[PDB]
Design a protein around this ligand. Structure first.
Ligand SMILES: CC(C)n1nc(C(F)F)cc1C(=O)Nc1ccc([C@H]2[C@@H](O)CCCc3cncn32)c(-c2ccccc2)c1
Ligand SMILES: [Zn+2]
Lengths: 164, 139, 213, 272, 135, 98, 173, 292
């Protein structure tokens, strides 16, 4: 909220290609995003941030595959590479394998039936590891509050904060 | 149609609705609202079909709603993504399984996310206080 | 107390009468610990002679288990049904002494039982005799014991008692030390916070008074 | 043979009754009362107790039944679930007077209990003793005798807090870790005494008692307590839930401190 | 649990007017004994199958299921029936209250052992070590 | 009205039947009520929709699971409400500065 | 632990340098050790900032980057093919040989955690061993290797009281 | 002679009642002394009441500026007049002939989960009672906070007469009153004053408690307070969330500084939870970690 009014009035109009890019990356459609990226190639390569847009293109497919897990429980590889537009069971299998390797998704691949099963069980909160994580987060919050209290005590004694 | 909707007989209800839609389209005050209404009605039946079931065979569902299994699967996915159906489709055997959410894990996840966001906001505000106190701006 | 009666009646008897009394004691219901009868010099004199088998059987009942009477069966005399049932009860007690969740497979292997109904009937008998207390879980095939009696002990077993009690005492001492240290730390933290707040207030008041001159 | 559970409130009632009567009359006097409670199956649980009125004729105690029934209706007005259980008195070992009074009481309830408190005692044990009446035939005559029962102390949280507050009678972590200290000290004392006796028996200073050593062996085998996996899962569930509560409380406190600092900063470094 | 032979001898020693039976059958004594057996078996088992319950009550498994369901419906017992698994489950006996009860029993054992040591052998270890610990 | 009377008594008998069980086969209910499996499923669907029977039908294996397993879920609702209030409160407190 | 210390020493030696540019041996060791620890970003940037003159002078950097490029695309057969195509004199040999073992363990863990039924040929390609060796190796692990269809089924793999006192002392102030 | 407090003399009580000094001053009674038995009786009655409110009477005497309470009894209340006074008179008549000579000195009632204070109805009742029968005192017990905090929550109040305006002088320790009872606590807070509460016991009671502790430590060592009060903490969290919402609404605009009060309530609940957890941690260290 505390942002200056320059970005909301003057800086925003110059960044019109990127708002179009977001608007296309608001409706799940890799073809439209590729078309827009190719149309605005000169603008994206003049600002030297080309290769950060191809990451958006390659992340749209990952977002679609993740959205597939919110509805399905077992999806054929050929069926999967038709809602995310991956053009082949092999590309869908390699995408799912890469996603599993990086921890983005919780899934298993069955090459016998050519299926992918979605598990969606990150962790049950009944182990000392989560206790340690909670303790670390609480220690960070305690240090934060201690610093805030130190700053307030240093502002309380200020003579300028005695006449008002 | 109303009685068959109440008595959980959806094939006949939808057949009569589709039969009378063509005649209803010639109305003056109801025609513009026909299509939307129909969609709404159909949607209700779907959540009214899966309400008693914890795992439903999709072939019987498709036969009940007079559609193929693929169109039913697409409609069910559209409903699960946003609507009132909380279920998961097992397309290997074409079975719609009722999904039961876990409350404890959900609360833990939301609380940890809120804590992380609060810490980020607090650090940002401390930096903002430092820059405001030091009178740093671009002119 | 049946064992007290048997001790009193066995003051001077020896020989065949001693063996008859030992058989009666083993077969007598309700007596499951034979440590007072074993320590008699009259009983211990059975080692030298032709009646050492009866003393070995008494030692097996006092300290051993049923599997011990699978490989040393020829030496000891024949056991009746009541004696074998008592030995099975004592084997169940021995198993429950070391672990408090006995799988059905272990009991089936130890007590030499064919089906689960016989084993569960034996466990129910043991519970009714009030030597062990517990419940049977058929789904998990477990016997969960809450309390089992203590069997007889030799002179080389008291070391384990003293070791375990020493460990418990050390644990209690450590707990008390930790409690005291934490109490001291909490009190110190409270005192330090109050002192810091009072110094801050005093400095603020001094600065305020100075500005009003 | 029933199993009896006792509440400290009953003992306090009896002691207060004795103190009041002794102070009022000027000399120690035996008191006679009644007990109420609840019986589930074969387990009796004695909850409360009200005084009873009795007279002495010749040399025998006669219980006023009309007053008893009046007080029974009075307490039934309030404590609906509680029921008459037996009577109590103060003294030493049971005496034929107690037999006569128990015969009188048995006309009210089929199987009453008999509680006796000893206000003048020298030992270090609670002087409460619980008996039940057993009928017997001796020389062809029907007499009754007393069979003692083993009693425990009932577990109630509010009762425990009240009794602790009464027994003691004069930071927050320091206040909390004073109730735990006073119990772990007794546990450590008891374990140390048992260990010293066992070591003395092992080295040899006292006669070899088999019963004590067998009980000690069973006690040693009783540890650890509930080392199953489901218990560990439940324990970690509790720990994680309390950790989340602590995290939320810490966030609330930090938000309050942040608000205070923001207010002070806006007062000093701003003009509004 | 009252087994079959005990009830057989009891019926043998009963006089004929005591054996009250309905016209269709279903002897009152036998039914009461079956109910008592099932209630008492509720205190030994955490859960039991229908076959073993019918073998322990000596009735057909279908009758065992019917009797258990009737008994649970009227509120005589606490439990539930899983028909697909064929398992009747009695009280759960959760973990943390069990831990508290076991702790209480262990401390009771300690107290009783100290009482017995002190009352069967005064002077000696008991009072001398009590004083020494105090000192 | 004989059909309505028959349906009323069948519904009452089924409600009494499902009282102790946790998971119960539908052919079992068909045997008890003396009706085919399809009519038992229709009756169960009507009863569950009318908020009379608290359970759900497993159609693939043809059984009925009764929702008898419940726990103390109010604590997590309270924690969720606390978390949401804390989120909004810290947003407002931070937005107070500038 | 013996490789992390060498990596730190190589990084410091490169940072100090006789004018920014380091010697080709430490450049090659740095690149290979970045490949070991799965620092693909760091290895890519190191290849970006290595002077072209050093690349022309020393041709082993080309082979090391070929191996790194096969690693970057996640091409296990390519990784195993390109590892056994070049060597040095006790400079990259231990690290280039530990790279093979690291890749082996990584592929085995990935197959275990990401599959429920994988063909024997695919498993051998992922690991790099021959098909018969791949099947016969998983014997003590019990992976249930099938015949005819040749399907492999991977198997799915104190201070507390002080902390609580600190928390309370913070909350109660 | 600690037992001398138990000796009751009627002549002195009649003389004091006929020479009432409390009719001149208003802040006269400032000390309340409660017997151990009476306190235990009130605590057990309030706990047996459950989540509802239970009320009873309080027998005792007066001694200078001290209100001494000796016993108690529970009124039926399933009622102000009629049934309550019938029970009071009948119970006093019954108890006068068995050794209980003292008459009523107050009334007690429970405030389960919302502190120890007098509402508007309680203030009106105390005014009515002190108008006719004097002296009098109102004891309020919180049976639920007693378990949660491990401390007996009890408060003996006495109500100022109508038309009297005392000049400030109120310490007013902080009480976590729920949201729906904050308004009632605000209007009627200066119409009564609290008496300092102390407890006493006889010599036989002291000896019996000392002998009882030899076997009562088992229940202390096996309490597990984290499970006995699980709905109280949930209600506290709900009330705290509502208070946080109100404080946030106050922040968006622009009690005094409602955020501080919400923070205090959150701290109290969290500290109680952590105490309950550390007790179980100590038990686990003592008993489960002796793994042989
Ligand atoms: C001494 C008693 C009998 N008494 N004497 C006179 C006087 F008229 F003589 C008048 C009275 C008298 O009943 N007061 C009273 C008032 C209100 C309540 C309840 C009432 O609001 C409804 C519940 C909420 C509440 C919170 N706090 C008091 N309440 C009670 C009361 C307390 C506990 C249990 C039952 C009732 C007693
Ligand atoms: Zn009130």
């Amino acid at each position: 909220k505390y942002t200056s009014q320059i970005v909301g009035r003057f800086i925003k109009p110059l960044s019109n290609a990127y708002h179009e890019l977001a608007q296309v990356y608001s409706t799940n459609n890799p073809s439209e995003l590729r078309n827009l990226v190719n149309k605005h190639s000169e603008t994206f390569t003049r600002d030297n941030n080309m290769g950060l847009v191809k990451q958006c293109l390659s992340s749209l497919y990952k977002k679609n595959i993740q959205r597939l897990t919110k509805t399905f429980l077992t999806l054929s590889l050929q069926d999967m590479a038709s809602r995310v537009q991956l053009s082949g069971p092999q590309e869908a299998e390699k995408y799912v394998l890469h996603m599993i390797e990086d921890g983005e998704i919780f899934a298993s691949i069955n090459q016998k039936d050519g299926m992918v099963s979605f598990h969606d069980n990150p962790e049950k909160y009944n182990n000392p590891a989560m206790l340690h994580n909670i303790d670390q987060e609480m220690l960070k919050c305690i240090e934060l509050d201690e610093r805030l209290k130190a700053m307030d005590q240093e502002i309380t004694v200020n003579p300028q904060f005695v006449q008002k | 149609i109303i009685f068959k909707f109440y008595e959980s007989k959806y094939a006949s209800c939808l057949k009569m609705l589709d039969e009378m839609k063509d005649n209803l389209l010639l109305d003056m005050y109801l025609a513009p609202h026909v299509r939307t209404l129909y969609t709404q009605i159909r949607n209700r039946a779907l959540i009214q079909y899966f309400s008693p079931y914890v795992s439903a065979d999709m072939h019987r569902m498709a036969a009940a709603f007079n559609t193929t299994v693929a169109a039913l699967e697409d409609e069910l996915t559209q409903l699960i993504l946003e609507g009132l159906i909380s279920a998961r489709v097992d397309s290997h055997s074409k079975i719609l399984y009722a999904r039961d959410v876990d409350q404890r894990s959900t609360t833990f996840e939301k609380s940890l996310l809120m804590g992380k966001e609060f810490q980020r906001r607090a650090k940002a505000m401390m930096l903002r206080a430092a820059v405001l106190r030091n009178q740093i701006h671009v002119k | 107390n049946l064992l007290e009666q048997f001790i009193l009646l066995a003051k001077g008897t020896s020989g065949s009468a001693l063996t008859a009394l030992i058989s009666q004691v083993l077969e007598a219901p309700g007596v499951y610990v034979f440590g007072e009868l074993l320590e008699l010099a009259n009983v211990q004199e059975l080692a030298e002679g032709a009646n050492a088998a009866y003393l070995q059987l008494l030692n097996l009942f006092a300290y051993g288990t049923y599997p011990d009477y699978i490989a040393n069966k020829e030496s000891l005399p024949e056991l009746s049904t009541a004696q074998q049932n008592k030995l099975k009860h004592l084997t169940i007690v021995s198993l429950a002494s070391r672990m408090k969740c006995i799988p059905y497979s272990v009991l089936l292997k130890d007590l030499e039982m064919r089906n689960l109904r016989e084993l569960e009937d034996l466990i129910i008998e043991a519970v009714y005799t009030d030597i062990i207390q517990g419940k049977l879980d058929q789904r998990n095939q477990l016997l969960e014991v809450d309390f089992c009696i203590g069997r007889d002990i030799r002179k080389k077993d008291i070391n384990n008692i003293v070791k375990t009690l020493h460990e418990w005492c050390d644990g209690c001492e450590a707990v008390l030390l930790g409690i005291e240290q934490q109490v001291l730390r909490a009190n110190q933290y409270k005192e330090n916070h109050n002192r810091t707040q009072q110094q801050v207030e005093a400095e603020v008041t001094n600065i305020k008074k100075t500005l009003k001159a | 043979s029933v199993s009896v559970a006792l509440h400290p409130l009953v003992i306090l009632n009896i002691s207060d009754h004795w103190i009041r009567m002794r102070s009022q009359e000027g000399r120690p006097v035996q008191v006679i009362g009644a007990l109420i409670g609840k019986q589930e199956g074969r387990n009796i649980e004695v909850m409360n107790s009200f005084e009873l009125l009795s007279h002495t004729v010749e040399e025998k105690i006669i219980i006023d039944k009309e007053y008893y029934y009046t007080k029974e209706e009075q307490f039934k007005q309030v404590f609906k679930e509680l029921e008459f259980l037996g009577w109590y008195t103060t003294g030493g070992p049971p005496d034929p007077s107690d037999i006569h009074v128990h015969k009188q009481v048995c006309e009210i309830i089929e199987s009453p209990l008999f509680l006796k408190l000893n206000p003048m005692t020298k030992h270090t044990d609670l002087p409460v003793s619980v008996f039940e009446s057993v009928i017997d035939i001796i020389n062809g005559e029907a007499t009754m005798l007393f069979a003692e029962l083993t009693y425990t102390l009932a577990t109630e949280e509010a009762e425990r807090i009240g009794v602790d507050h009464v027994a003691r009678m004069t930071s927050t972590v320091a206040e909390h870790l004073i109730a735990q200290h006073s119990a772990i000290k007794m546990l450590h004392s008891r374990v140390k005494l048992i260990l010293e006796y066992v070591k003395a028996s092992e080295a040899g200073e006292v006669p070899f008692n088999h019963e004590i050593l067998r009980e000690a062996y069973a006690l040693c085998h009783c540890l650890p307590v509930l080392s199953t996996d489901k218990f560990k899962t439940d324990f970690y569930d509790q720990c994680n839930d309390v950790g989340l509560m602590a995290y939320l409380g810490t966030i609330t406190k930090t938000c309050n401190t942040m608000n205070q600092f923001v207010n002070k900063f806006n007062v000093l470094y701003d003009r509004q | 649990i009252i087994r079959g032979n005990q009830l057989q001898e009891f019926a043998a020693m009963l006089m004929p007017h005591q054996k009250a039976t309905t016209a269709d059958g279903s002897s009152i004594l036998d039914r009461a004994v079956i109910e008592h057996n099932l209630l008492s078996a509720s205190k030994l088992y955490n859960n039991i199958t229908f076959e073993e319950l019918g073998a322990l009550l000596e009735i057909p498994a279908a009758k065992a299921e019917k009797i258990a369901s009737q008994m649970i419906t009227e509120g005589r017992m606490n439990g539930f029936i899983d028909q697909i698994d064929g398992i009747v489950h009695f009280e759960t006996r959760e973990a943390l209250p069990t831990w508290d009860k076991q702790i209480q029993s262990l401390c009771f054992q300690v107290n009783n052992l100290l009482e017995k040591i002190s009352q069967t052998a005064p002077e000696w270890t008991a009072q001398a070590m009590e004083a020494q610990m105090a000192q | 009205h004989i059909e309505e009377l028959l349906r009323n008594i069948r519904t009452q008998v089924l409600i009494k039947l499902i009282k102790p069980y946790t998971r119960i086969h539908i052919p079992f209910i068909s045997k008890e009520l003396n009706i085919d499996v399809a009519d038992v499923e229709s009756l169960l669907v009507q009863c569950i929709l009318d908020n009379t029977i608290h359970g759900r039908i497993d159609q693939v294996n043809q059984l009925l699971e009764l929702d008898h397993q419940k726990r103390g879920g109010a604590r997590y609702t309270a924690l969720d409400k606390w978390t949401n209030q804390l989120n909004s409160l810290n947003q407002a407190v931070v937005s107070k500065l500038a | 632990f013996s490789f992390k210390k060498l990596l730190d020493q190589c990084e410091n030696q490169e940072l100090e340098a006789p004018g920014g540019i380091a010697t080709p041996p430490v450049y090659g060791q740095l690149l290979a050790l970045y490949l070991l620890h799965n620092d693909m970003n760091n290895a890519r940037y190191l290849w970006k900032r290595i002077p072209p003159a050093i690349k022309s002078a020393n041709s082993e950097l080309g082979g090391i980057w070929s191996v790194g490029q096969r690693i970057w695309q996640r091409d296990f057969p390519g990784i195993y093919t390109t590892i056994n195509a070049h060597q040095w004199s006790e400079t990259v040999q231990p690290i280039m040989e530990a790279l093979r073992d690291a890749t082996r363990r990584r592929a085995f863990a990935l197959v275990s955690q990401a599959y429920t039924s994988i063909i024997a040929d695919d498993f051998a390609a992922f690991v790099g061993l021959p098909v018969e060796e791949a099947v016969k190796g998983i014997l003590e692990q019990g992976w249930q290797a099938d015949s005819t269809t040749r399907m492999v089924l991977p198997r799915k793999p104190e201070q507390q009281l002080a902390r609580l006192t600190d928390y309370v002392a913070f909350l109660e102030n | 002679s600690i037992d001398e407090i138990y000796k009751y003399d009627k002549k002195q009580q009649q003389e004091i009642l006929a020479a009432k000094p409390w009719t001149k001053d208003h802040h006269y009674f400032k000390y309340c002394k409660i017997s151990a038995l009476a306190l235990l009786k009130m605590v057990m009655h309030a706990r047996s009441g459950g989540n509802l409110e239970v009320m009873g009477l309080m027998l005792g005497k007066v001694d200078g500026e001290t209100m001494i309470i000796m016993d108690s009894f529970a009124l039926p209340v399933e009622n102000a007049q009629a049934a309550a006074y019938e029970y009071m008179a009948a119970y006093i008549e019954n108890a006068k002939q068995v050794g209980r000579l003292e008459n009523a000195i107050g009334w007690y009632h429970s405030h389960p989960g919302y502190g120890c204070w007098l509402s508007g109805i309680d203030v009106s009742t105390q005014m009515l009672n002190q108008q006719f029968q004097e002296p009098f005192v109102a004891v309020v017990i919180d049976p639920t906070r007693t378990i949660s905090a491990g401390k007996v929550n009890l408060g003996a109040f006495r109500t100022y007469p109508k038309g009297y305006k005392p000049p400030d002088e109120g310490p007013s320790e902080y009480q976590t009153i729920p949201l729906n009872k904050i308004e009632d606590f605000g209007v009627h807070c200066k119409q009564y004053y609290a008496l300092e509460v102390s407890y006493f016991k006889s010599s036989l009671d002291r000896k019996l408690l000392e002998l009882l502790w030899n076997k009562y430590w088992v229940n202390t060592l096996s309490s597990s307070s984290l499970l006995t009060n699980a709905d109280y903490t949930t209600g506290q969290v709900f009330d705290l969330s509502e208070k946080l919402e109100q404080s946030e609404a106050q922040l968006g605009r622009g009690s005094e500084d409602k955020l501080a009060k919400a923070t205090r309530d959150s701290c109290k609940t969290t500290i109680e939870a952590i105490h309950g957890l550390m007790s179980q941690v100590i038990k686990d260290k003592l008993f489960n970690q002796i793994n042989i």
